[PDB]
């Protein structure tokens, strides 16, 4: 009933800006089986540094508004960077099933934060094929959320025993993308940064 006569704001008195710029314009991004996680802490998080980058294919925020991110404080900030195809961008979401979500990068169901994905054909394609980007397509079980698997063990698909040599039914789990500029936009390379709060 008694109305407030004044509004006070008490934030900590630090002036260091958060290094979102170093996440977003790194020269080499990681593969999706070995994605890069950077901890962001003890800084002022200005989110307009993200907005002066490329027109994004996806800027989808879950559990938070994208226009209110300058008004909030966060406990633990993580930035996860990798490179995927264009038809797997929707698979970086809560409650998804496929190859990137099941075997490479799993998001939790109770996920808060943003998924920012932009086209990077200019940076990560070669005309003969860019074979430096890999994904895992063979694994015994689905991944837990935020579990990284960097194993290169030779996977057996038959009833025969397998002794580390890729022979009749023995396959390596890592398949390359082979990115080309002659591909369509669903097979072109896309750089994904996932901000987790």
């Amino acid at each position, epitope marked *: 009933r008694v109305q407030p006569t004044e509004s006070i704001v008490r934030f900590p008195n630090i002036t260091n800006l958060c290094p979102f710029h170093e996440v977003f314009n790194a*020269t080499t991004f990681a593969s999706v089986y070995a994605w890069n996680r950077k901890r962001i802490s003890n800084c002022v998080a200005d989110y307009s540094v993200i907005y002066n980058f*490329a*027109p994004f294919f996806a800027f989808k925020c879950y559990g938070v508004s994208p226009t209110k991110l300058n008004d909030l404080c966060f406990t633990n900030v993580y930035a996860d960077s990798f490179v995927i195809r264009g038809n797997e961008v929707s698979q970086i979401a809560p409650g998804q099933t496929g190859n990137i979500a099941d075997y490479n990068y799993k998001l939790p169901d109770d996920f808060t934060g943003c998924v920012i994905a932009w*086209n990077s*054909n*200019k*940076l990560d*394609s*070669k*005309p*003969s094929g860019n074979y430096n980007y890999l994904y895992r397509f063979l694994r015994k079980s689905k991944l837990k959320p935020f579990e990284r698997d960097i194993s290169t063990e030779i996977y057996q698909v038959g009833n025969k025993p397998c002794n580390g040599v890729a022979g009749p039914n023995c396959y390596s789990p890592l398949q390359s993308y082979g990115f080309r*500029p*002659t*591909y*369509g*936009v669903g097979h*072109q390379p896309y750089r994904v940064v996932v901000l987790s709060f």
Partner: antibody, heavy 125, light 103 residues
Framework: EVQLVQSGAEVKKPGESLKISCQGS????????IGWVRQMPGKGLEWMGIIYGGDSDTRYSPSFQGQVSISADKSLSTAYLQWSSLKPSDTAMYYC??????????????????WGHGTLVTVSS | IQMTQSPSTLSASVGDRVTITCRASQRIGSWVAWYQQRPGKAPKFLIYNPSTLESGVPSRFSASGSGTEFTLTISSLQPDDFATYYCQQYDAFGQGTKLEIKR
């Protein structure tokens, strides 16, 4: 079939302005670079500059920076080469061409696989 | 980077093997691009990597290259193969090697 169609031949007075178009068809224009190559009469090919069709990222040669301007319109799937003030040493055949290479490595695959037919620009009083 | 073609004008007849050479100033990558320009026509791209043109139809043009010396070899010459040839990597074009018929 990947095709590049340029504008017609130009006869200009010195001091005038000129813009030259290059329209691409048969390919995704936003996934490739378009470069401009001049050829003086009786002379060889000279690299002038490249532009990427997606976000208009432009690299110029150091012998052509400030003399020319290279632009692109990805909605019309075209690229432009433009002078501000024309000189009589700009009498040349100008080719647009399609290329794609590594961004941070200049020594990997920066080849012009498809070429335009060329425009002829003559400047004389 | 400066690229210099070692024959300036070469003479050959119809049906021979022609080797032309392009050398760089500094060290560049594994291959260079080769172009053929008839007089009055646009340049036509011939070869960068010989593994790219490994289709069912065999290729008339072959190419070899170290870090400095590069070589384009035409195994058999048609009358349409007497033109001006250029080597290029990124922004450096070599000066042209012109093939003339020999009589």
């Amino acid at each position: 079939e990947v095709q590049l169609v340029q504008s017609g031949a130009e006869v200009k007075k010195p001091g005038e302005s000129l813009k030259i178009s290059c329209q691409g068809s048969g390919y995704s224009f936003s996934s490739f670079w378009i470069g401009w190559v001049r050829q003086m009469p009786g002379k060889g090919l000279e690299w002038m500059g490249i532009i990427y069709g997606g976000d208009s990222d432009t690299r110029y040669s150091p012998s052509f920076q400030g003399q020319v301007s290279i632009s692109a319109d990805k909605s019309l799937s075209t690229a432009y080469l433009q002078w501000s003030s024309l000189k009589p040493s700009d009498t040349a055949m100008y080719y647009c061409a399609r290329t794609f290479g590594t961004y941070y490595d200049n020594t990997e695959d920066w080849f012009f696989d498809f070429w335009g037919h060329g425009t002829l620009v003559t400047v004389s009083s | 980077i400066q690229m210099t073609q070692s024959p300036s004008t070469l003479s050959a007849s119809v049906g021979d093997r022609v080797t032309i050479t392009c050398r760089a100033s500094q060290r560049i990558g594994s291959w260079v691009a080769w172009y053929q320009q008839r007089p009055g026509k646009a340049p036509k791209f011939l070869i960068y990597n010989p593994s790219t043109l490994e289709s069912g139809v065999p290729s008339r043009f072959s190419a070899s290259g170290s870090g400095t010396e590069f070589t384009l070899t035409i195994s058999s010459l048609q009358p349409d193969d007497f033109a001006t040839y250029y080597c290029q990597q990124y922004d450096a074009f070599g000066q042209g090697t012109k093939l003339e018929i020999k009589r």
